[PDB]
Amino acid sequence: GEIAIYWGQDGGEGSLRETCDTDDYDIINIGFLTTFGHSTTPILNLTKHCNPATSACKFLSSEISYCKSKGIKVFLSLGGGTGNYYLSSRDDAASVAQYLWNNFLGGQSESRPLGDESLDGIDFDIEDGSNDYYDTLAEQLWILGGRSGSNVYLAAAPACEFPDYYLREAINTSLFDYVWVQFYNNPRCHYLGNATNLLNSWNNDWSTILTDDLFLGLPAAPQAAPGGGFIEADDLISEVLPTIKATYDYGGVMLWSKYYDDDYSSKIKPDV
Ligand SMILES: *[C@@H]1O[C@H](CO)[C@@H](O[C@@H]2O[C@H](CO)[C@@H](O[C@@H]3O[C@H](CO)[C@@H](O)[C@H](O[C@H]4O[C@H](CO)[C@@H](O)[C@H](O)[C@@H]4O)[C@@H]3O[C@@H]3OC[C@@H](O)[C@H](O)[C@H]3O)[C@H](O)[C@H]2NC(C)=O)[C@H](O[C@@H]2O[C@@H](C)[C@@H](O)[C@@H](O)[C@@H]2O)[C@H]1NC(C)=O
Ligand SMILES: *[C@@H]1O[C@H](CO)[C@@H](O[C@@H]2O[C@H](CO)[C@@H](O)[C@H](O)[C@H]2NC(C)=O)[C@H](O[C@@H]2O[C@@H](C)[C@@H](O)[C@@H](O)[C@@H]2O)[C@H]1NC(C)=O
Ligand SMILES: *[C@@H]1O[C@H](CO)[C@@H](O[C@@H]2O[C@H](CO)[C@@H](O)[C@H](O)[C@H]2NC(C)=O)[C@H](O[C@@H]2O[C@@H](C)[C@@H](O)[C@@H](O)[C@@H]2O)[C@H]1NC(C)=O
Ligand SMILES: [Ca+2]
Ligand SMILES: [Ca+2]
| R_g over Cα of the chain | 17
Q: Tell me 109's DSSP state.
A: -
Fill in the amino acid letter for 6: Y
Resolution value in angstroms: 1.5
Whose CA is closest to 35, among 72, 93, 89, 78?
A: 78
Known catalytic residues?
A: 127
**Where in 63-134 does DSSP place strands (E)?**
73-80, 84-85, 121-126
Buried b (16+ CB within 10 A) or exposed e, 239-258: bbbeebeeeeebbbbbbbbb
Other CB atoms within a 10 A radius of the CB of residue 152 amount to: 24
Q: How many residues does the chain have?
A: 272
| Contact 172 CB / ligand 3 (< 6 Å) | yes
- CATH numbers and ranges of domains, the chain: 1-272 (3.20.20.80)
176: which residues sit within 8 A by CB, 6+ positions away? 124, 138, 154, 155, 156, 170, 211, 212
d(CA 29, CA 19) in angstroms, rounded, equals 11
**Plot region of 187 (φ>0 → left; ψ -120 to 50 → alpha; else → beta):** alpha
User: How far is the centre of ligand 1, averaged over its atoms, from the C-alpha of 193 (Å)?
Assistant: 10
Ligand nearest to the CA of 117: 4
| Contact 266 CB / ligand 2 (< 6 Å) | no
Measure the N-to-C terminal CA separation of the chain; round to a whole number of Å. Answer: 5
Which backbone phi and psi does 59 adopt, to 5 degrees? -60, -20
**What are the CA-CA distances from residue 4 to residues 30, 61, 64, 100, 181 (Å)?**
11, 20, 15, 21, 12
| Contact 194 CB / ligand 1 (< 6 Å) | yes
Pocket test for ligand 1, best of 189, 192, 194, 238 (most atoms within 8 A of CB): 194
| Contact 196 CB / ligand 1 (< 6 Å) | yes
